[PDB]
From a paper:
Collapsin response mediator proteins (CRMPs) are cytosolic phosphoproteins that are mainly involved in neuronal cell development. CRMP-4 is encoded by the gene DPYSL3 (dihydro­pyrimidinase-like protein 3). Like the other CRMPs, it is involved in neuronal development and binds to tubulin dimers and microtubules. The structure of CRMP-4 closely resembles the enzyme DHPase, which also belongs to the amidohydrolase superfamily.
The diffraction patterns of all CRMP-4 crystals of form B showed diffuse reflections independent of the cryoprotection used. Analysis of the native Patterson function for all data sets collected for crystal form B revealed two strong non-origin peaks. Combining the experimental information from the sharp/streaky diffraction pattern, unexplained native Patterson peaks and the ghost density from shifted molecules strongly indicates that the data exhibit severe lattice-translocation disorder. CRMP-4 from crystal form B was initially solved with uncorrected data. However, owing to the lattice-translocation disorder the refinement was performed against DIGS-corrected data. The model consists of a dimer with the two monomers in the asymmetric unit related by tNCS. The crystallographic twofold symmetry relates two dimers which form the biologically relevant tetramer. Both monomers in the model consist of residues 12–499. Only 11 more residues, up to residue 499, were revealed with the CRMP-4 structure, which form an extended loop protruding from one protomer towards the other. The location and conformation of the three most distal C-terminal residues, Gly497, Met498 and Tyr499, were resolved for the first time in CRMP-4, but only in crystal form B. These residues extend the C-terminal loop further in the same direction and pack well against the hydrophobic Trp295 of the neighbouring monomer.
Author numbering:
A (entry chain A), B (entry chain B), C (entry chain B), D (entry chain A): 12 to 499
The structure:
Amino acid sequence: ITSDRLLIKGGRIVNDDQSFYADIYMEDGLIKQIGDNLIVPGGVKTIEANGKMVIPGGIDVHTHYQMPYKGMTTVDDFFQGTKAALAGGTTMIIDHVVPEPESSLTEAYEKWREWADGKSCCDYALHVDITHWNDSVKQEVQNLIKDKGVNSFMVYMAYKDLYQVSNTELYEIFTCLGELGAIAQVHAENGDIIAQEQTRMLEMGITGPEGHVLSRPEELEAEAVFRAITIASQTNCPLYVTKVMSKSAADLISQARKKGNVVFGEPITASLGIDGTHYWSKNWAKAAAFVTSPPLSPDPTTPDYINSLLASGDLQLSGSAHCTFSTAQKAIGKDNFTAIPEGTNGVEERMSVIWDKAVATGKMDENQFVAVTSTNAAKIFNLYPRKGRISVGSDSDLVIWDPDAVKIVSAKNHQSAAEYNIFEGMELRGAPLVVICQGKIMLEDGNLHVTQGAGRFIPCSPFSDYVYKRIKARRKMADLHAVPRGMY
Amino acid sequence: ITSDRLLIKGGRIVNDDQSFYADIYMEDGLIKQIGDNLIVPGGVKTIEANGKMVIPGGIDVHTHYQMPYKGMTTVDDFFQGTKAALAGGTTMIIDHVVPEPESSLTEAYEKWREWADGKSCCDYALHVDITHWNDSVKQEVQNLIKDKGVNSFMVYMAYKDLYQVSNTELYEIFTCLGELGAIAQVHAENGDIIAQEQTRMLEMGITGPEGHVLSRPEELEAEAVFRAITIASQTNCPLYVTKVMSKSAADLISQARKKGNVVFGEPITASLGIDGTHYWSKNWAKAAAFVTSPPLSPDPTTPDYINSLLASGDLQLSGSAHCTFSTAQKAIGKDNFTAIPEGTNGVEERMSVIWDKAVATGKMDENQFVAVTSTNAAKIFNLYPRKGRISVGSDSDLVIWDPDAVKIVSAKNHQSAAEYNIFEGMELRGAPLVVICQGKIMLEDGNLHVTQGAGRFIPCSPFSDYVYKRIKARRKMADLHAVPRGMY
Amino acid sequence: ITSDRLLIKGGRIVNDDQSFYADIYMEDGLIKQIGDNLIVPGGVKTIEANGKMVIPGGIDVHTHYQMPYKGMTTVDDFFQGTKAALAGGTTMIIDHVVPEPESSLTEAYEKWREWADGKSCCDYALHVDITHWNDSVKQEVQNLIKDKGVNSFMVYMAYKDLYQVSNTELYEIFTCLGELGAIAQVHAENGDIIAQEQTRMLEMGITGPEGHVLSRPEELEAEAVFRAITIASQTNCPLYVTKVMSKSAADLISQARKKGNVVFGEPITASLGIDGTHYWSKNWAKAAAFVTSPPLSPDPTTPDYINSLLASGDLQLSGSAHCTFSTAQKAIGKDNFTAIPEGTNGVEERMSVIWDKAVATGKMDENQFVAVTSTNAAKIFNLYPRKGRISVGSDSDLVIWDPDAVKIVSAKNHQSAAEYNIFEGMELRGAPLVVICQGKIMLEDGNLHVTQGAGRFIPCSPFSDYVYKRIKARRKMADLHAVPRGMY
Amino acid sequence: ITSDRLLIKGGRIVNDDQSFYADIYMEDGLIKQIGDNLIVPGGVKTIEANGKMVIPGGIDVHTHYQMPYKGMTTVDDFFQGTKAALAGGTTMIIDHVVPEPESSLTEAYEKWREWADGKSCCDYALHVDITHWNDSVKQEVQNLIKDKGVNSFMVYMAYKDLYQVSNTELYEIFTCLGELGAIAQVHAENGDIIAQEQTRMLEMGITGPEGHVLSRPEELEAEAVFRAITIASQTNCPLYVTKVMSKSAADLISQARKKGNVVFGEPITASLGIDGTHYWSKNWAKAAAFVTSPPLSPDPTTPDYINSLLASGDLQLSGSAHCTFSTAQKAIGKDNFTAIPEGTNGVEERMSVIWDKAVATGKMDENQFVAVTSTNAAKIFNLYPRKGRISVGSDSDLVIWDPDAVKIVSAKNHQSAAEYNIFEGMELRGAPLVVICQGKIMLEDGNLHVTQGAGRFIPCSPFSDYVYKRIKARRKMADLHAVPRGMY
């Protein structure tokens, strides 16, 4: 894409590896020059930073924009949703393609590309959820990775008699995805037990939002996480844990990474920002707004712990799992929490939450902030250094970040079409002043300047080195010597 | 049972709680008097101890005497097997009743009682393996606990398409067994994955004994253990992990007990005594003799670690899982390790192994030795203080133990009908000199004096306090307050 | 001591090992008979229990009755203090003998015996604090253990330039105490750093009670605990950690016990009952009442965690560290928290706190309650089965315990001469109805019937088997083989 | 420094963040251009890589070249030692300046600069060991950081009555070094206890090399590491653990980094390559060659574990602690191991060992290899991207690395003046083919082309962002609110 020549002067550039004062000159969707006191053509827009930070545009790895649900749709679509992202400093999103059981994955890919190409304000990629399994689906997975630029597929361990897969199915699927060089994602909760504990919570007459959290205690996440981690290690396939919510799940990932397992852990704005004490709100609707799987841990020590592990590297990248429904849609679970559609907000609040909860708190510094907001995502999904880096050659997706900025979050002001915001009234430190996506100024002085359909689908190639170099090294060590033995 | 009056003089008595020098006078299968310088009727056999230790007779909680297998039988039956037990200082055994899938559990109970009543040299109890599940089996479990004196039922997580149970089945079964007050046992290995990894190990042309261990690495035990532990905690049902073999499984039990879970861990002589490096023996038959599930960890640090955790209380009781086949029976897996019948020896070596590997090594003292050889078993299966204690009122099952004794283990000398002994050539410190079961001298000067059928079935009542007091306390804390909420 | 014949009928007896319904008949300070439907002489007082629990009388292992401090004394003396103990179900106390630096330990022993013999309502023993170190003190320690019946000596790692001992001194002292067969106790806090952090907290103008907690964060306890544990392992000497307050210290003890170290951990009523959030009270005096070393962790998750580890066996016995000062005495640290005399209440509340916080919460059962309130103390200090057990032969110190009792704690009602109670207003479940010490009824219908000086000093012999059997086994394994080597 | 124009064609460039095929053109000690198919002046030396790896030149952070010892010197001086480094792919070294107790640190700095400037084949920096402490030394530390370009100072916790510092001294020193912005290094072993255990090992007549390891078991490292970590956290000062040898020390660093402490851990070639079983060699001299503090763990699982933690990021950078003495020098401890001079080889073997033990084993990939061999060192000591990166602007220190190379290590072939090599006979995978330092070819076809004195002292500035951004963030959070309180 062609676009205006743009110079940013006097900025503190911040990447995952270092910080240094320098001017940045961008042109035609790329960063052409970086340095001090540059030779710049006249008739070119200039932005004065005054030493404010300049960082790669965020990569939200988990979104559900206009997601299908019971002949219905999430109230944030690819357009309004990407407005929310950009408003919050995020310039790329990876949305989950959810083919219906007994449906084609390729046809769901077609469905999703159409939507996002026409509506997305910013660049994007897609994950494909493997909602069912057979020879025909496997064939589609090979094609999606080869031809359609998808390197990431999620399997559900929850959702009994819907999206759930057996242990044998996980073995086959992790084996296939390891061979083909893709990132095996999991929604890691034990569906078999949750299904029972839902029926138990209803039998005790607990039909409100608190029934949701109490039906899925973090014990059932940890088990799922542990079983996934285990099967993935036996197939020598890299594992990506989606939406990490509990302290026990995060410790199992930490435990496994120390051993040497190729396991990644994605916390989301919700678990990084707030706990699940609002499931017990007197206001049904407010509590219904927090209903997502896995749930916000009622253990209020969890947010701060999750931020600690994200800082230590035991978790590597942040997402939002942005999946917003209106109160009217939540309401179809008025008298039964299992019918409440699942999902909350977070896409706009993501980067400011991490800065407030991790950076301002001294847990991590601006560089690691970049790693966990953009760069590591980019390395895992094979978008580096194209994304998540302010270097020459790299796309011109970047944010002027003010660490001294302080903004209160409210549903009045957010870009989401949700009536509620789970971070309602939270004073957060640090926010974007300016956002540049595709080299164009899409945020300045509090004003969005987006264009519908502007975003381009970025294809992601298999065998990201960050992920697959060790896996390849181990593949070529599994020569099992049988014992030389005279017969009996 | 009536039996001779017997006095033991000048002995160092050793229970789980203390040691003290005192004379013991027994009569009619009971201990009548304990003390210094006793008033004893003349014409009464006297045994001089010279200060050698006197301990409760061991309780082996895991045996498979004359176990059915493919229209066949283990070469140690209830008679010869209990000779082996007594030879090794063990005076009670709990054997596993294995009803065939789609068979009656009650009819298997009948089958097993007949065999043991007629052949057992010593007292015994029974576990009943829940090899399949439905309304009719549940009804049988209620009856077995109420009428037949069985308080312990095992479920298999391994053995795909044979004994395996789903997660939903484990929830129902742990719920039932918690309500009825029984001990939920598990063979904790992941069958779904092992089944695949067996097919993989055969595809690599590894058909010998090393194929067995490599098909079931300890990762697959840990997962099964963790999933059991988790489901058991959600049903508030006490968990008993059978045949603990790996360091990772033992740590998960230790991890869970510290949190407050009611979880018990049973190592066996095999894992306490030796590692799985002999799976790679050039001699097929010798390696085929070690084939048992879960396997001996090839990690040679495992024996010593298992003994450390048994000493610390993180494991509570020892077993043997005595399940011996002849080489000729093992041989039907000549060309395919999955057809090798599974099981090894250990019943005779149990107590001497623990003394050598734990007591002589300074890890645990004689008192904790008693706890992990008899008393804790007795407390868990509700046989305390009837068994596992030298006090007045208690059955007269006891051993004169020599800690300075040193004996080499060999197949030449063992009471087993196995050609091989997995502890062949092991010099062990500590062994029994005299054994008294039912008040009768069944071992002295290296000579067994047993009687076939002498043993009596001991019924075990549900709701052992050691296990169920906390479980009962928690049952009456699960009142879940629904939120008071005006309608929308 | 002679005393009335006393029968207790229809009680549920509860020891550390079992529970069973039986009558108890006591005479002349001992338990003569236990059983059903006993042959009892007429003209003998009878107590009807109606199935209420009967437990061994508590052993508080940590008290500072009328402790010297700057030409002053704690407001609870040996008489009023032991009234408080008995009021709370505790029938034995072990008080800390604190000889002044450069003073004789034997002369401090003489001082303390005089006081306690003349004032104690109940039986008692003594620890002796090793407040300084040299050849002459070592000689006194040998004599105290041989002649004076003291098997327990504490060293301070805190209190710089007062009671503090170097690492080299701890090596010598743990070596001596291991050889002589005594229990090495530690006040485990790092004095060197605390001393600095006190000066730092004053420089920030923080002179109130919150200065105390903030000057000694639990990091400094953990380090001291870890260093002690380490030195103790190198000298093969058993370690007893006094007054465990933090989660990190308790984990280090748990970590060490699993490895096989002989290490014991004593939580106190304060850390089992409440947290240190009341250090920030607006009311100076109330916050000054909580000032004790190590401090109550401000981390409010700590009480519940401490109770969990006490239940799991990772901590073994409870104390109170009863060391009460009046507000007027606390006040000498009005303008400087380092001058506040250290210590709080707990002796009366000890057993009820554990029942409320651990037993009623389902964490531990009545049997483990007995272990951690009396029996394990008795085993460690070599008072078993004399104390901490309702068996024939054992002293008649026992309590009728009502688990359904519910009492509110207040300074209005306590037996302490303290104006404040750190558990003020706490509704606790479970309390004593009747208490029998030395076979006499010292509590009934809310009324104390004590006698000053009644208590007898119980001598404690070295080399308790519970502690020293493993240590002895290891002593006789440290034969270090030098390598046979031809010269160069 | 001016130097030939040099082009490297057809290479696989490998940095810590990515790998990519590109040509590299160097000139005058810098990398001028990187890219495909470059515009290059004629009359310029060209090196064909054939796709072999190109990596930043290693940074050995721990060397003791011609170190003083008892009026003596290590047999590898700054010249021959840097030959060894370069032979092994290492192009920068940081040597330890060891001022004598009661000596000037500045004068030791002068001494060391003279030596290294005149002899070093490659670039270098210096650490300064704080061997004693007072007002005058502190003043020198301020000056060294401000004027002399030193940002790293080591303190000894071992070496009683020589280099040892109290806990109070560590508090002052970590406080000073935190304020001034320097890296607090520690030799973390407990000297007080080791001193005793040496005297104990001699009293048992164990005077050979095995006496050394047995006098300093890893328990005494862990404690020192833990105490350092703790004091460093209380002073908010970054900690760098030198020469990590044991599994327990590495776990304490891992434990602390997860919590959020600024703690770094430096393993050395010795602990990464081999264990301490050769302390028991019959050949005195061979065992005497392994004598270094802390010692090689006799636990043979240690090498592989250390490599695992280096891979996981729980350790960050490698060193060698190159400190070679001749057998004749070792021999002065013939009859007493405490007189054996301490230190072994490793500088030449460093990078090949890590590749063999970590990369070829699948534990870490080529990128993380770069991080732990050069880049992370460069980030911690503030030499990034000047060093440890093949980018434009960066010094031209780089190695052509062959991962398929296989070389046997021997004393016959090494560049060291040591008669022995602790890795004698070890077949290692991966080695350098070509080495370029300062843009000059210093290794090709097995031939060194060095120049004495060529190396330049690189000054290291305080407050490396990698280290100090979080520390600065926390400094400005320690505002401790005193409670507003009306007086009493």
